Amino acid sequence: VHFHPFGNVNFYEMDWSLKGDLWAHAPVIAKEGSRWYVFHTGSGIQIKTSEDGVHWENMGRVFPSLPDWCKQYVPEKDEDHLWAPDICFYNGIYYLYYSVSTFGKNTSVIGLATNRTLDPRDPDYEWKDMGPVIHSTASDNYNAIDPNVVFDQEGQPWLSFGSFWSGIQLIQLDTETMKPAAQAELLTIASRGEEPNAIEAPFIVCRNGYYYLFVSFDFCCRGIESTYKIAVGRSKDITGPYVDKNGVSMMQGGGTILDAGNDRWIGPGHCAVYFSGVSAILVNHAYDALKNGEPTLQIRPLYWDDEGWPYLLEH
Numbered sequence: 001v002h003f004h005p006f007g008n009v010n011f012y013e014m015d016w017s018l019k020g021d022l023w024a025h026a027p028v029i030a031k032e033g034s035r036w037y038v039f040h041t042g043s044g045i046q047i048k049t050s051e052d053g054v055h056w057e058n059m060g061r062v063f064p065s066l067p068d069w070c071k072q073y074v075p076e077k078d079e080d081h082l083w084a085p086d087i088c089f090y091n092g093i094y095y096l097y098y099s100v101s102t103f104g105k106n107t108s109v110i111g112l113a114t115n116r117t118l119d120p121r122d123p124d125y126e127w128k129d130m131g132p133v134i135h136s137t138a139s140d141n142y143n144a145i146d147p148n149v150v151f152d153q154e155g156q157p158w159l160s161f162g163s164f165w166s167g168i169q170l171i172q173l174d175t176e177t178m179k180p181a182a183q184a185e186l187l188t189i190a191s192r193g194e195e196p197n198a199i200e201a202p203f204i205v206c207r208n209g210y211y212y213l214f215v216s217f218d219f220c221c222r223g224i225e226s227t228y229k230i231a232v233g234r235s236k237d238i239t240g241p242y243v244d245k246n247g248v249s250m251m252q253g254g255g256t257i258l259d260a261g262n263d264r265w266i267g268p269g270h271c272a273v274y275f276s277g278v279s280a281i282l283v284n285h286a287y288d289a290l291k292n293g294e295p296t297l298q299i300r301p302l303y304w305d306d307e308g309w310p311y312l313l314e315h
């Protein structure tokens with residue numbers, strides 16, 4: 001995938017027995033040479049680094065304090081934790097989207113930061129604050145958090161996002177600004193079709209002729225009480241209609257459950273999917289039942305059946 005490049009790595013041959021600094025919530029990954037990076041929810045957007053993809057060390061943050069403009073959109077925010085970053089690489093620039101919000105409310109904005117490199121030893125390393133991408137207010141029926149960027153088969157970039165309210169949103173981006181095209185409409189593409197509309201964290205990939213919409217269902221953010229699960233559906237057109245493996249509309253609670261966790265890893269969710277050739281990984285967090293529900297980075301190989309549906313080997 002041109003905008004999530006991994007090189008010549010065979011994700012299926014790696015031994016993903018992760019070690020080190022694994023606290024993470026809503027993680028995404030990028031690779032640049034021998035170095036791998038995780039961006040995740042935390043103070044100023046938290047960053048980890050790894051020499052190999054398996055052993056992780058904390059590497060600080062994107063911003064020392066909240067960008068000043070954020071306060072205009074979310075004036076009640078009184079801490080610097082930024083949520084659910086998403087990274088892609090395009091025209092020689094890293095585009096890093098992130099969410100400014102407060103829990104349980106839809107007064108929110110997605111911001112964009114850019115860099116020419118992810119290696120802070122590189123003299124060109126500098127995260128530039130590129131301001132707001134798209135917002136939500138209390139009068140809107142959507143929530144401007146949980147961004148993902150995907151490029152469609154025609155090379156057009158798209159932003160999915162959303163969490164509760166009417167569900168998952170989709171909008172076309174301008175290639176020059178990497179923010180919503182002035183003549184683009186907001187489309188709702190997935191919903192539980194019930195209240196609470198517990199669907200969030202979209203991530204869309206294109207694989208072998210379909211767009212796959214990965215989402216998280218049910219309740220994050222409750223430690224060992226979480227009920228998060230990862231679900232997927234697909235469509236031949238990026239604008240839908242997305243359906244699950246059984247044929248259920250993702251606008252009516254459709255979604256094939258890929259993982260609902262186990263006795264140790266509770267509430268897996270807020271996922272990302274990356275490719276290296278035909279090989280693939282699923283990246284997500286899960287709440288560690290041993291270690292007091294602390295959200296933990298997971299990276300697992302993701303297989304694809306002969307009907308094109310993804311699956312994990314542990315199920």
Ligand SMILES: OC[C@@H]1O[C@@H](OC[C@@H]2O[C@@H](OC[C@@H]3O[C@@H](O)[C@H](O)[C@H]3O)[C@H](O)[C@H]2O)[C@H](O)[C@H]1O
Pocket residue numbers: 102103104105141143145163164165166194195196197198200220
């Ligand atoms: O999960 C992320 C964080 O919580 C998410 O939602 C907070 C939720 O508030 C309720 O949503 C109410 C919605 O208004 C209706 O139109 C819509 O259909 C309802 O679902 C949920 O029970 C809380 O988790 C936020 O998105 C973010 O804070």
Ligand SMILES: OC[C@@H]1O[C@@H](OC[C@@H]2O[C@@H](OC[C@@H]3O[C@@H](O)[C@H](O)[C@H]3O)[C@H](O)[C@H]2O)[C@H](O)[C@H]1O
Pocket residue numbers: 025026041042081083084099102103145146163200201220221222223269270293295
């Ligand atoms: O239970 C443990 C969880 O740790 C905290 O981590 C940071 C939290 O993430 C924010 O919400 C981000 C939303 O959840 C994502 O999976 C949803 O898709 C993102 O938008 C929380 O509000 C921050 O506190 C969790 O809160 C905490 O519950």
Ligand SMILES: [Ca+2]
Pocket residue numbers: 026084085086146147148201202203270271
């Ligand atoms: Ca995400």
Ligand SMILES: [Mg+2]
Pocket residue numbers: 013
């Ligand atoms: Mg082997």
